[PDB]
UniProtKB/Swiss-Prot annotation, chain B:
<comment type="function">
    <text>Subunit of the fusion protein that is processed upon entry into the host cell. Mediates fusion of the virion and cellular membranes by functioning as a class I viral fusion protein. Contains a viral fusion peptide that is unmasked after S2 cleavage. This cleavage can occur at the cell membrane by host TMPRSS2 or during endocytosis by host CSTL. In either case, this triggers an extensive and irreversible conformational change that leads to fusion of the viral envelope with the cellular cytoplasmic membrane, releasing viral genomic RNA into the host cell cytoplasm.</text>
</comment>
<protein>
    <recommendedName>
        <fullName>Spike protein S2'</fullName>
    </recommendedName>
</protein>
<feature type="coiled-coil region">
    <location>
        <begin position="9"/>
        <end position="50"/>
    </location>
</feature>
Length: 50, 50
């Protein structure tokens, strides 16, 4: 029905916190996903640009 | 001979024990951590509490 594409930049050891039900600085106070999140999490290294 | 009126005594005893057994199962722990809900939601994470 509708697709939302959230975009941001984090470190490498913080990519695991994007999964649902995780706990951390990025998961809690920066970007929280519900326990029943439907979608795909995509991340790639952008050290050459950022 | 109290067994004479046992027909109605059994009825009232079944009516009593059906409610007492129903409320006794409320304090049970079927494959769970605690019988009460306050000690589960405030101790476990939402992904696992549900």
């Amino acid at each position: 029905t509708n697709v939302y594409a959230d975009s941001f930049v984090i470190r490498g050891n913080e990519v695991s916190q994007i999964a649902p039900g995780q706990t951390g600085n990025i998961a809690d106070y920066n970007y929280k996903l519900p326990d029943d999140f439907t979608g795909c999490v995509i991340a790639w290294n952008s050290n050459k640009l950022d | 001979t109290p067994s004479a009126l046992g027909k109605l005594q059994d009825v009232v005893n079944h009516n009593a024990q059906a409610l007492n057994t129903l409320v006794k199962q409320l304090s049970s722990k079927f494959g769970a951590i605690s019988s009460v809900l306050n000690d589960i939601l405030s101790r476990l994470d939402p992904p696992e509490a549900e």
